[PDB]
Amino acid sequence: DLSASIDISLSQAVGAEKVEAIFPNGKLKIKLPKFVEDGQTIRLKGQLVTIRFKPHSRFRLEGRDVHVDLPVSIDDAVLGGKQEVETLDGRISVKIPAWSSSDRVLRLKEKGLPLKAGGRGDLYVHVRIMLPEGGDKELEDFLQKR
Amino acid sequence: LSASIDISLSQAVGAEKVEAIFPNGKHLKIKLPKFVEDGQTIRLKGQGEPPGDALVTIRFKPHSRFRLEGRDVHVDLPVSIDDAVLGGKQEVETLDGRISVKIPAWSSSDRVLRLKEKGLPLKAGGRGDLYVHVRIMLPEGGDKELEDFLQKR
Ligand SMILES: [Cl-]
């Protein structure tokens, strides 16, 4: 037989699409199972492959749920707006409720990792009000007047 | 003889005496060590007739506001937009108490502030740190001055 280890991103675990495995002896493309767990080992008939999740800074895993922070300009938080957020499945636009604070959380169902029992977990988007970087000097002037 | 006591994080810091109630009705006051861990057990020798021993297990009450990472503690701090841009003093409830904290100017929601010795006691001695995660919040009723400014942009 032959034993090897492969690292796949979180998005690859969802997609199940084929991934390439390199063995010590030099030899395979394998379709990932619907339910993939970090550290899971698969016995491949006709030959042991270990699956490790590639680190994703943006995504923090809680079980099979996924959480991602969404930077949001002050204007978008007060007035609401549509902002694109990168996820496992792809880049998707998301609605920002009016008067959203940094505690706001948006729930997207079945966008998380597949569940063993079936279906998928959820992706939670944590609204985070950020300042631009270089400064505003329009907001800065407004607030000092207050 | 076995019993379990639930203490808040603030109690873990204080070491203060706590009361243990056993199945047979015997009650014992015990001085907590400076360093207390969740699930930690203290054996009081003799105290248990079944002679025997009395074992008291200390469990930490869950606290939503405080999340424990080792002996350091992290807590979210709501901060007005005005205080975030201009900096200002904002009150934060902590293990020791309600404490005012300085907000650096131009602080964003990813920013973290370090308060030393505000965490749980350390085994070696001293205390851990409290990290304060700034979160810019909007008023529950509205401003209508900031609201007008942002729509113009
Ligand atoms: Cl230090």
Give the integer Cα–Cα distance in Å for B115 and B132: 8
Q: Ligand 1 centre from B14 Cα, in Å?
A: 22
Which method was it determined by? X-ray
User: Are A143 and B81 inside 8 Å of each other by CB?
Assistant: yes
Residues 6+ apart with CB under 8 A from A26: none
Which residue type is seen at B61? Answer: K
CB atoms A143 and B82 under 8 Å: yes
Tell me how far apart the alpha carbons of residues B80 and B136 are, in angstroms, rounded to a whole number. Answer: 6
Contact B55, B43 (CB under 8 A): yes
Note the maximum CA span of chain A.
Answer: 75
Phi and psi dihedrals of B95, rounded to 5?
-65, -45
Q: What is the DSSP string of chain B?
A: -EEEEEE-HHHHHH--EEEEE-TTS-EEEEEPPSS--TTEEEEEES------EEEEEEEEPP-SSEEEETTEEEEEEEEEHHHHHH-EEEEEE-SS-EEEEEE-TT--TT-EEEETT-SPBPSSSSB--EEEEEEEE--SS--SSHHHHHHT-
Top-level class of domain B2-60: mainly beta
Domain with CATH 2.60.260.20 in chain B: 2-60, 66-139
Kindly determine whether residue A128 and residue B150, on different chains, have CB atoms separated by under 8 Å: no
With a CB cutoff of 8 Å and minimum separation 6, the contacts of A108 are A87, A94, A122, A123, A124, A125
Judging by DSSP bridges, how do beta strands A65-72 and A123-129 pair with one another? parallel
CA distances A110 to A16, A22, B28, B34, Å, are: 15, 32, 52, 46
- Cβ atoms of residues A9 and A54 within 8 Å: yes
From the CB of residue B82, how many other CB atoms can be counted at a distance below 10 Å?
Answer: 17
Q: Report CA(B133)–ligand 1 centroid distance (Å).
A: 19
**Fold (topology level) of A59-129:** HSP40/DNAj peptide-binding domain (2.60.260)
Query: What number of other Cβ atoms are within 10 A of residue A16's Cβ?
Result: 14
Contacts made by residues A129-132, CB under 8 angstroms, sequence distance 24+: A129/A72, A129/A73, A129/A74, A129/A77, A129/A101, A129/A102, A129/B81, A129/B108, A129/B109, A129/B135, A129/B136, A130/A71, A130/A72, A130/A73, A130/B108, A130/B109, A130/B110, A131/A74, A131/B84, A131/B85, A131/B106, A131/B107, A131/B108, A132/A73
> Which amino acid, one-letter code, is at B19?
E
The first and second tokens of residue B46, run together, are: 């003799």
Q: From the candidates A78, A104, A105, A138, which should be mutated to test the interface with B, based on the most B CB atoms within 10 A?
A: A78
CA distance B2 to B50: 10
Report domain B66-139's class. mainly beta
Any bridge partners for residue B89, and if so which? Answer: B102
Nearest CA distance, B60 vs chain A (angstrom)? 22
Q: B116 alpha carbon to ligand 1 midpoint, in Å?
A: 8
Ligand 1 center from residue B95 Cα (angstroms): 20
Nearest residue, CB atoms, A146 vs list B84, B110, B145: B145
Q: How many CA atoms lie within 13 A of A66 on its CB side?
A: 25
- To one decimal place, what's the resolution in Å? 3.1
Give the Cα-Cα-Cα angle B98, B104, B105 (nearest 5 degrees).
135
Backbone CA torsion sign across A35, A38, A40, A45: positive
* Domain span(s) for CATH 2.60.260.20 in chain A: 59-129
Most B CBs within 10 Å, among A73, A99, A129, to test the B interface = A129
